Design an enzyme around this catalytic site. Structure first.
Site, PDB file in Angstrom:
ATOM      1  N   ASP A 145      54.073  19.464  42.930  1.00  0.00           N
ATOM      2  CA  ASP A 145      53.713  18.610  41.806  1.00  0.00           C
ATOM      3  C   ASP A 145      52.964  17.321  42.206  1.00  0.00           C
ATOM      4  O   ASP A 145      52.693  16.501  41.337  1.00  0.00           O
ATOM      5  CB  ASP A 145      54.978  18.308  40.992  1.00  0.00           C
ATOM      6  CG  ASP A 145      56.000  17.586  41.833  1.00  0.00           C
ATOM      7  OD1 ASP A 145      55.615  16.621  42.531  1.00  0.00           O
ATOM      8  OD2 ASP A 145      57.195  17.990  41.809  1.00  0.00           O
ATOM      9  N   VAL A 161      60.745  20.969  44.603  1.00  0.00           N
ATOM     10  CA  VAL A 161      61.403  19.679  44.533  1.00  0.00           C
ATOM     11  C   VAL A 161      61.218  19.104  43.137  1.00  0.00           C
ATOM     12  O   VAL A 161      60.082  18.870  42.711  1.00  0.00           O
ATOM     13  CB  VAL A 161      60.863  18.695  45.605  1.00  0.00           C
ATOM     14  CG1 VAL A 161      61.575  17.356  45.502  1.00  0.00           C
ATOM     15  CG2 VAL A 161      61.004  19.268  47.023  1.00  0.00           C
ATOM     16  N   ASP A 162      62.328  18.871  42.421  1.00  0.00           N
ATOM     17  CA  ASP A 162      62.267  18.333  41.064  1.00  0.00           C
ATOM     18  C   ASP A 162      63.064  17.026  40.966  1.00  0.00           C
ATOM     19  O   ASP A 162      63.981  16.794  41.750  1.00  0.00           O
ATOM     20  CB  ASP A 162      62.808  19.350  40.042  1.00  0.00           C
ATOM     21  CG  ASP A 162      61.970  20.594  39.828  1.00  0.00           C
ATOM     22  OD1 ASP A 162      60.748  20.567  40.153  1.00  0.00           O
ATOM     23  OD2 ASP A 162      62.519  21.596  39.326  1.00  0.00           O
ATOM     24  N   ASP A 175      56.064  24.259  44.503  1.00  0.00           N
ATOM     25  CA  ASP A 175      56.948  23.242  43.950  1.00  0.00           C
ATOM     26  C   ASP A 175      58.417  23.630  44.068  1.00  0.00           C
ATOM     27  O   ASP A 175      58.915  24.375  43.221  1.00  0.00           O
ATOM     28  CB  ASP A 175      56.604  22.947  42.486  1.00  0.00           C
ATOM     29  CG  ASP A 175      57.306  21.733  41.914  1.00  0.00           C
ATOM     30  OD1 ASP A 175      58.281  21.256  42.538  1.00  0.00           O
ATOM     31  OD2 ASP A 175      56.874  21.249  40.852  1.00  0.00           O
ATOM     32  N   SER A 211      46.351  22.425  58.273  1.00  0.00           N
ATOM     33  CA  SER A 211      46.747  23.475  59.215  1.00  0.00           C
ATOM     34  C   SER A 211      46.045  24.765  58.857  1.00  0.00           C
ATOM     35  O   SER A 211      46.131  25.190  57.700  1.00  0.00           O
ATOM     36  CB  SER A 211      48.268  23.692  59.141  1.00  0.00           C
ATOM     37  OG  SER A 211      48.935  22.493  59.503  1.00  0.00           O
ATOM     38  N   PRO A 222      57.572  21.484  35.712  1.00  0.00           N
ATOM     39  CA  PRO A 222      57.987  20.946  37.018  1.00  0.00           C
ATOM     40  C   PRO A 222      57.165  19.788  37.560  1.00  0.00           C
ATOM     41  O   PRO A 222      57.473  19.274  38.633  1.00  0.00           O
ATOM     42  CB  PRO A 222      57.925  22.171  37.934  1.00  0.00           C
ATOM     43  CG  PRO A 222      56.864  22.997  37.344  1.00  0.00           C
ATOM     44  CD  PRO A 222      56.958  22.816  35.849  1.00  0.00           C
ATOM     45  N   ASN A 229      45.957  25.699  54.159  1.00  0.00           N
ATOM     46  CA  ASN A 229      46.826  25.013  53.182  1.00  0.00           C
ATOM     47  C   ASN A 229      46.533  25.400  51.723  1.00  0.00           C
ATOM     48  O   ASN A 229      46.971  24.692  50.805  1.00  0.00           O
ATOM     49  CB  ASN A 229      46.811  23.496  53.304  1.00  0.00           C
ATOM     50  CG  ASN A 229      47.021  22.986  54.684  1.00  0.00           C
ATOM     51  OD1 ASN A 229      46.154  23.108  55.544  1.00  0.00           O
ATOM     52  ND2 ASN A 229      48.151  22.353  54.928  1.00  0.00           N
ATOM     53  N   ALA A 280      51.278  24.715  56.645  1.00  0.00           N
ATOM     54  CA  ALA A 280      51.837  24.057  55.473  1.00  0.00           C
ATOM     55  C   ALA A 280      51.030  24.553  54.221  1.00  0.00           C
ATOM     56  O   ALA A 280      49.966  25.179  54.354  1.00  0.00           O
ATOM     57  CB  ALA A 280      51.706  22.535  55.633  1.00  0.00           C
TER      58      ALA A 280
HETATM   59 CA   LIG Z   1      58.647  19.475  40.803  1.00  0.00          CA
END
Ligand SMILES: [Ca+2]
Length: 755
Positions: free
Chosen positions: A252, A75-76, A73, A1, A205, A241, A69
């Site tokens: 990650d 999300v873990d 990070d 994008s 992470p 991006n 987009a």
């Molecule tokens: Ca992560």
């Protein structure tokens, strides 16, 4: 994008220009939906994916907005400690806590249903269990519990009239998405939005952490830390991006890096070449970036150095001379099947061989396959998304930079051989492969062009049209699924704002029961191919002067009326006095234009495809249900104010009003695909509307983690190189940050304070 926002100091004959090209893949019906909303504090025009209540791409006459987009990070993975004596329990803060669980049954048309259980801990849903280590891996998303607020932030930002009002809504959008601003006074801005975890010291992470309590996030970072810039000194904001700012850490994913090699550099190259851009010249950046080979700039210097002492009779030199005479732009021959120059095929063959000899060879199997793609991978239908510099090529680029790279080369990717030797051996391989295919004369090679296909299956692999509805375009273009432009305060004409977009194949996806396609089914396909665009109207006068139809709609709840006007491209404009009725009009026109697409998106986001399509979608449906917790979404909706709830309830009730008409006269109104696939549309509720956004935005652009795979790579690297070198090689392939990464915000404006 991609996106380029040009401010007053860089715009010609205007105060600001915003050009957005979100890249979602290509589909029929169109990925986005054109809509105008007028009333209840809204006055907007634009288009948005899956007809969400909030428009991603548009303007309100005072400000314009867009997005790309480019996840950090958020999300873990928490490795939950299990008990052999207490199944379904995990250890947290010295106690055994019971997991939540729910049963789900997948109904299967003409097949056997299947029941399974989804488990969830205080960290998130369980995505994997490992017997040998007594671990249940739970996925923690910083936006969990803020999905519905994010959708509402995307809707309320449309009412903002200045930077402070807009950033107030940007702070409430929890998904990791870049947001862009422009206004009638020539101001421009950027915010890398999203909820980000405030991690314990020492938390890496890129890998899982124990879920026993010690590694729990302290909470969420302040919005003051989200990268943002207002009126940058450069006079523009560009993104493809890439990193938001210096030292900002990427997601990650082992396949995702922000390094010295980045395609966003191609936009800066164009924008820095002249002092100012007109609206037409800003739009023309789409044509230029769409045809750019992204690898030539990166590897031509090393190729020229390696072949510098070769004579013109050497085929390795002939390949490099052909690249050296090339402007790096791909054009299709008159035949519509081949490229004018063979440069991309030469780079593909060379880079494929280079990666095999360098990154792939340095990484133990089976992880070498993560770094083997050249970035030119395609099928006869063409690339399914954008073209980018591959992860393997980014790592190779750092190795070729040597001392200029800020990444320590823990392992010499050239394995002790001089870099020229490996570069020449890869040229030998490319020559063998290419000359066998095209003969020995490089000046006559007609390499195949990449094509573009508007697919009949949506991005989940679920039909949203019959297979025969796939549409074809000879020339692949590395550009937005849609492209839109807003021009503020143009010096020509009497309007304070002008806007354009292209929603291909068309505004409507409707195919009547007898096979007759709507007049707006594919009337934007030629305009898409030729870099054309259609005007987007905002004012009541402009909408009225360009209308094809006007009608009143009686609201089922109270017999009040809303007005709907459709423009010459079938784009609807809703006129109402309150939130409920405005979103009722929106839901109604969506049901008229895209009912089959939306019903299939609803089933895709809830994992209810097999119920109507059969055994082919069972594991798809199970995977969807495992990846969310419906009670969380329902609780978020239940706690909304009456005003916020009215957006979702109005939208669903509006769809229902048209579904009622369809089901009373199916011989005239039922979209043909319902007959082809053998089922009927049913009513929608607010949960269904929220789940279109959760399932296609939060899960597509904000739910990326490869920590479990990253751990397996690190383990194999430590086995191969030893504990010390193995971790340093992990840091070389999947760095946390790379200070040479091209960034949307210049370092002089700001850098990330967290180290
Ligand atoms: Ca992560």
């Amino acid at each position: 994008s991609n996106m380029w926002v040009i401010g007053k100091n860089k715009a010609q004959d205007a105060k600001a220009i915003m050009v957005n090209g979100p890249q979602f893949g290509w589909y029929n019906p169109a990925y986005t939906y054109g809509i105008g909303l007028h009333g209840a504090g809204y006055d907007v025009t634009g288009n948005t994916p899956f007809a969400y209540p909030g428009l991603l791409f548009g303007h309100n006459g005072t400000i314009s907005w867009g997005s790309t987009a480019g996840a950090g990070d958020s999300v873990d993975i928490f490795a939950e400690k299990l008990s052999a004596e207490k199944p379904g329990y995990y250890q947290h803060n010295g106690e055994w806590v019971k997991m939540l669980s729910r049963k789900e049954t997948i109904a299967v048309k003409d097949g056997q249903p299947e029941t399974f259980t989804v488990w969830r801990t205080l960290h998130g849903n369980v995505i994997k269990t490992d017997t040998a280590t007594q671990t249940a891996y739970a996925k923690a998303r910083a936006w969990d519990g803020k999905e519905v607020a994010s959708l509402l932030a995307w809707t309320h930002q449309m009412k903002a009239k200045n930077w402070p009002e807009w950033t107030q809504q940007a702070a409430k959008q929890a998904l990791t998405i870049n947001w862009y601003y422009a206004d009638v006074n020539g101001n421009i801005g950027y915010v890398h939005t999203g909820a980000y975890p405030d991690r314990q010291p020492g938390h890496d992470p890129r890998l899982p952490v124990p879920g026993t309590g010690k590694w729990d996030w302290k909470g969420l970072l302040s919005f003051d830390l989200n990268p943002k810039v207002y009126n940058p000194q450069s006079g523009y904001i560009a993104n493809w991006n890439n990193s938001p700012q210096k030292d900002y850490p990427a997601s990650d994913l082992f396949a995702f890096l922000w390094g010295g090699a980045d395609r966003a550099t191609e936009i800066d190259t164009i924008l820095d070449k002249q002092p100012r851009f007109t609206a037409d010249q800003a739009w023309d950046v789409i044509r230029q970036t769409s045809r750019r080979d992204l690898n030539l700039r990166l590897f031509l210097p090393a190729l020229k150095d390696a072949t510098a002492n070769l004579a013109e009779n050497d085929p390795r030199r002939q390949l490099v001379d052909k690249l050296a005479s090339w402007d790096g732009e791909n054009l299709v021959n008159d035949d519509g099947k081949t490229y004018q120059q063979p440069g991309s095929a030469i780079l593909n063959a060379w880079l494929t061989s280079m990666l095999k000899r360098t990154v792939v060879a340095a990484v133990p199997a089976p992880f070498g396959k993560w770094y083997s793609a050249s970035g030119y991978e395609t099928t006869q239908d063409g690339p399914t998304g954008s073209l980018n510099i591959s992860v393997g090529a980014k790592i190779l680029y750092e190795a070729l930079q040597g001392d200029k790279s800020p990444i320590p080369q823990a392992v010499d990717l050239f394995g002790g051989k001089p870099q020229q030797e490996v570069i020449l051996a890869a040229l030998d391989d490319a020559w063998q492969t290419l000359s066998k295919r095209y003969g020995n004369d490089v000046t006559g090679w007609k390499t195949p062009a990449m094509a573009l296909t508007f697919r009949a299956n949506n991005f989940f692999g679920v039909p949203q049209a019959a297979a025969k509805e796939a549409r074809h375009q000879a020339e692949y273009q590395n550009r937005g699924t849609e492209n839109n432009m807003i021009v503020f305060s143009p010096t020509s004409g009497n309007r304070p704002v002008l806007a354009w977009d292209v929603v291909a194949p068309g505004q409507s996806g409707f195919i009547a029961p007898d096979g007759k396609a709507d007049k707006h089914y594919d009337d934007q396909l030629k305009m898409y191919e030729s870099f054309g665009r259609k005007s987007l109207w905002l004012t009541p006068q402009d909408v009225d002067e360009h209308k094809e139809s006007q009608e009143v709609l009686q609201v089922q709840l109270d017999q009040t009326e809303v007005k709907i006007v459709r423009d010459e491209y079938g784009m609807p404009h809703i006129y109402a006095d309150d939130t409920y009725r405005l979103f009722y009009g929106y839901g109604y026109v969506v049901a008229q234009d895209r009912l089959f697409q939306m019903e299939m998106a609803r089933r895709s986001t809830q994992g209810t495809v097999s119920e109507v399509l059969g055994k082919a979608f069972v594991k798809f449906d199970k995977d969807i249900r495992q990846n969310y917790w419906p009670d969380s979404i329902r609780a978020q909706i239940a706690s909304l104010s009456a005003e916020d709830k009215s957006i979702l309830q109005g939208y669903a009730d509006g769809m229902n009003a048209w579904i009622d008409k369809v089901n009373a006269s199916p011989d005239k109104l039922l979209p043909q695909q319902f007959s082809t696939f053998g089922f009927k549309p049913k009513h929608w509720e607010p949960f269904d509307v929220a789940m279109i956004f959760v399932g296609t935005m939060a899960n597509r652009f904000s739910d990326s983690t490869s920590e479990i795979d990253n751990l397996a790579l690190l383990t194999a690297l430590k086995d191969k190189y030893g504990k010390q070198q193995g971790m340093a090689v992990f840091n070389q392939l999947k760095w946390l940050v790379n200070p040479s990464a091209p960034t949307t915000i210049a370092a002089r404006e700001s850098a990330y304070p967290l180290k």
